[PDB]
Amino acid sequence: VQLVESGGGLVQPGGSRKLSCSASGFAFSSFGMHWVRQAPEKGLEWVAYISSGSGTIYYADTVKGRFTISRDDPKNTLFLQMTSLRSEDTAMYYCVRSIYYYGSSPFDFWGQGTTLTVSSDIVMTQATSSVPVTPGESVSISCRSSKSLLHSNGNTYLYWFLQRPGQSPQLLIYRMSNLASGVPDRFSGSGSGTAFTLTISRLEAEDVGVYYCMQHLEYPLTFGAGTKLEL
Amino acid sequence: ELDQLRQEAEQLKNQIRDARKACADATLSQITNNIDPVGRIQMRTRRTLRGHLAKIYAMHWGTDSRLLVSASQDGKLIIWDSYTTNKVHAIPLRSSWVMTCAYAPSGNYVACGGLDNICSIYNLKTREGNVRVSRELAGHTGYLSCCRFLDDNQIVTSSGDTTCALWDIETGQQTTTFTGHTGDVMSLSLAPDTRLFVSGACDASAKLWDVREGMCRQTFTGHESDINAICFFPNGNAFATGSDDATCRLFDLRADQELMTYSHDNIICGITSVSFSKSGRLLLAGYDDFNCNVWDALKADRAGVLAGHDNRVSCLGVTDDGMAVATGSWDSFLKIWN
Amino acid sequence: TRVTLAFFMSLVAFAIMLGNALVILAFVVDKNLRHRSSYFFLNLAISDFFVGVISIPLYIPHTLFEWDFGKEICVFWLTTDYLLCTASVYNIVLISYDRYLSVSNAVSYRTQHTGVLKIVTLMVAVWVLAFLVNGPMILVSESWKDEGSECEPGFFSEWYILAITSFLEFVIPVILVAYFNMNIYWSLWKRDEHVELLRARRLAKSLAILLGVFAVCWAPYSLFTIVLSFYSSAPKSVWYRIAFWLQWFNSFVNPLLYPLCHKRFQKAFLKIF
Amino acid sequence: ASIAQARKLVEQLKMEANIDRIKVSKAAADLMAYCEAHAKEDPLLTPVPASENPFRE
Amino acid sequence: CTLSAEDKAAVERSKMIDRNLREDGEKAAREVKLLLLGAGESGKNTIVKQMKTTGIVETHFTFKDLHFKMFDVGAQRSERKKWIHCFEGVTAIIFCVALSDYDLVLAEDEEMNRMHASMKLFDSICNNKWFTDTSIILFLNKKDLFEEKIKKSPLTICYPEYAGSNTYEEAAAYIQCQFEDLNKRKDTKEIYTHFTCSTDTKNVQFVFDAVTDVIIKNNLKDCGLF
Ligand SMILES: CC(C)CCC[C@@H](C)[C@H]1CC[C@H]2[C@@H]3CC=C4C[C@@H](O)CC[C@]4(C)[C@H]3CC[C@]12C
Ligand SMILES: NCCc1c[nH]cn1
What's the CATH fold of domain A124-225? Predict the structure, then answer.
């Protein structure tokens, strides 16, 4: 599977730009699609979401009314039209796919992302940052939620993502404890319902990066400030 | 010659019969004549699943006892979330004529077989996000009447070829073939230890098979007509058969003899499907008179009835944790009782 | 006091209500009942239902229990009755056009895809046209009626206008229901023998009842009015009032004839019961 | 000719003759003991409270 | 509602699944399903040829904007009682009978006659408890062979008490009547008999006409008219 973004670049403030996300290798029609932006040297920020069949569309309050998300299923493409580009819209945009049914793993594959530079709610907190732990020693990254993510049905909608340097984020843990497919068993997740821990059994050269905690209890989806790991 | 072998077979059958008669010192009824009867089982339709647009021929619960798979001859294999009645998946079958379906204990795969003589294994968990046909096991010369997963790689199918087969899904070849039956094998039931399985056929005979060896160990001939359904007792040392004889029968492997006959004068229709509760105290048999009947297993009396369906109850399945019953029928609705 | 009449009239109103409500119910409950015909059966029931719920009961007092006359209610009742009734008829003509097409072009009828909107379009067009036939003229001529008058449409004075309305609400429909029903018979018989001719008898008997009940119910009144208006210019006899009630008995028997006899509705009813 | 196949049937019966059979009383006792031991585990046997019923409504 | 974001998205996915199921079902109800039956060869395969290893063979063909799915179940040398109820809702049953089999004897059983076999199969299938309403389209194949062979061998060898002249027309009509009289339900169903013309394409046309009359009568029965 792959999602390739295009359409970014240098834009004057107040201008309009269209971002395209070409999807291949998977049934694009069955996947809800998110646009998630990351500011330069900052954490991830959720931008927009359009469901399968365009039944439901949600926008971040920051960009609501200025951004329009759409999907061309016959062409297997995702579009984000941006009308009033402020100075806070400079960012790398990632096209994420998420399919929602019982036992699915949303936010599984994140596109490469495209850079867009302009000319010049539940809050997740990750207090710990720049952990200097060395490989071979277990490290636990802690995240905290203002509102209890435990739901009546029993699912705790807390997602752990890992972004290696110079690479798109990848899903590590879905719904608190569930381990994403294709992810080494070294990662484990736990949580009481408001404070969650991601424990790494062993550390390798590919485990270094920035770890983010997202909540999917309600929109807008909120990413905690990234927790950086260094050797 | 032929006559000598025929007489030898007849005398062997008589020997087995008299051995069974000698071992039948007591009946199950007189053993359980003093046990307290199960109270009137009042089960209500907790859920109703209405996606199918044709007759439902088989359903199977997932091992988590929440996901369900049901096959209908509209050409659809639907995976439901039984708690929320949501349709997790809808798989368009290559052949609309399917009379069995299975859910893998792992949950990654489902199986579907029918009049096309092919068992299609569908891979539910794919990176492409859609269910695709992982394999198409072919080689049976008759319809597939039942299929069951031993594990993610081994499957057991029963056909109208008067034979059962154990397939290695990865290679797509029949690892073993069981050829003891003389009639269309209409049902299948893997033992809880997954080392034995009982197959009932249209010759009114149910045979116990060892998957590892490939040889029949015991045969049971207590019925009068086709054995449409079969199910193992939870402990694995007994099983129950439903037949067009309008009776259910409980056969014990160790005793190699039937223990109880669940039959009523007011009942004259066949049994499409049978199942046991988790404790094994209740035998739930889906009859053709549109009503599923819940029998006490230890005592022949009928505990209750499930009268939700307006057509023949084709499939019946109890959750692994025993929380619910799922009855499918030819009226295109599956109904989750509790 | 003859309040026994009120018992009867309320009872028949109830019958219209229950009968048609059951047809409305089965439609909602069963999702099998979503054929082009089934939507049309709903429309028939909706129109008729309100004869029992809106029209008939308001009439009870005016006719029997003194009066409850309102310069507004009078118009409302008049416009509603002459809409619900003319819509019931138009639905019969629609059900019959559906059946004509079933038999006449059975390939196309089967293979055609009819979006709920196309069906809802036609269902609504029945109501629109129904209103147009009598409603504008009831509203417009509400004034001509002046005072010291029974609650009758104002255009009753002009036989010619009355005739136009009955042409569009009885003559045109009865010609068409009969054409359609006839082609339904002609077809079977001409496939275009004891058992064949026996079955053809049953088709024609049943198609005849359907045309018969339409006319034997609806006509007495449509004819009574024109003749009285043209000749006598009137004040209502026992008969006129029997003919008034005949045209409502058509709304009671409609659910019995059209939807109840449909096999698919019968299946649905049996489940509910 | 085909009688050899029928001869194989005979051999199968021989195997079923070698199966050791316990008394039916013991089998019935074991079935009853299993059914009594897991009586509390079965939710269908005894209707569980609606609080812990997954299909509450 | 109390549903979380993922639960609401799952419910939306289930609604989309239901819409797809409804569309596929309404598309499938617009196709004519014909159950194809015959005894041995019986020209059945040829009938499949006219209109275009194990298990059911499904032939999908369109004609005059009507889609036919014909299910040849000949290969299922299994117990028919255990799977014949799967076709309870077929529009019609195309039953092929070889006329030339009147004198031929069954290869499987020398005593048994092929024609009387098809007669037994027809009696079992027209009076079946599942096919009370479905109409049977009888296809009497190989009329040329039968016409050439009736001169050499009289029909009386197969049918006792046949007082015909052994001409093609009289013998063919007698065989058609003998097959059509096995129908013990002459009111609920009808039997449309046709002598297969191998040369012309009239076979699919006859199937189309019979199916249109079945559809018309089904509509009239559902409406309750007759
Ligand atoms: C009084 C007239 C002028 C206007 C009102 C017409 C009303 C009573 C009729 C006309 C069209 C009808 C609707 C046509 C289509 C549908 C969609 C169906 O899924 C439910 C019934 C429903 C909603 C019908 C309800 C009754 C209806 C709304
Ligand atoms: N169809 C006109 C309204 C009416 C007449 N009689 C009873 N109701």
Answer: Immunoglobulin-like (2.60.40)
Is the distance from the beta carbon of residue C59 to the nearest atom of ligand 2 less than 6 Å?
Answer: no
Q: Are E3 and E83 within one domain?
A: no
- What's the one-letter identity of residue B317? G
Contact A164, A221 (CB under 8 A): no
Q: How far apart are CA B204 and CA B200, in angstroms?
A: 7
Beta bridge partners of C15: none
Task: Map tokens 């509390």 to a residue.
Answer: D40
* Cα E40 → chain centroid: 14
Q: Which domains does chain B have, with CATH numbers?
A: 6-337 (2.130.10.10)
Asked if the Cβ–Cβ distance from B73 to E86 is below 8 Å, we say yes
Which residue's CA is minimally distant from atom 3 of ligand 2?
C82
Experimental method: cryo-EM
E22 and E36 part of one domain: no
Q: How far apart are CA E114 and CA B3, in angstroms?
A: 33
Contact C71, C49 (CB under 8 A): no
**Chain A positions in Cβ-Cβ contact with residue B104 (cut-off 8 Å):** none
Domain that holds residue C217: 4-272
Q: Extract the tokens encoding A148.
A: 């209890």
Q: Which residue of B has its CA nearest to A99?
A: B129
Buried b (16+ CB within 10 A) or exposed e, E112-146: ebbbebbbebbeebbebeebeebbbbbbbbbbbeb
> Which residues does residue A142 pair with via DSSP β-bridges, in sequence order?
A197
Q: What Cα–Cα distance (Å) separates residue E25 from each residue in A130, B29, C32, E30? A: 58, 50, 11, 9
Q: Rounded distance, CA A229 to CA E20, Å?
A: 47
Domain span including residue E59: 31-218
E225 lies in some domain: no
- What is the three-class DSSP state of E89? coil
Q: How far apart are CA B160 and CA B156, in angstroms?
A: 14
Burial E11-42 (b: 16+ CB within 10 A, else e): bbbbebbbebbeebbeebeebbbbbbbbbbeb
Dihedral through CA C38, CA C40, CA C45, CA C48, nearest 10?
Answer: -170
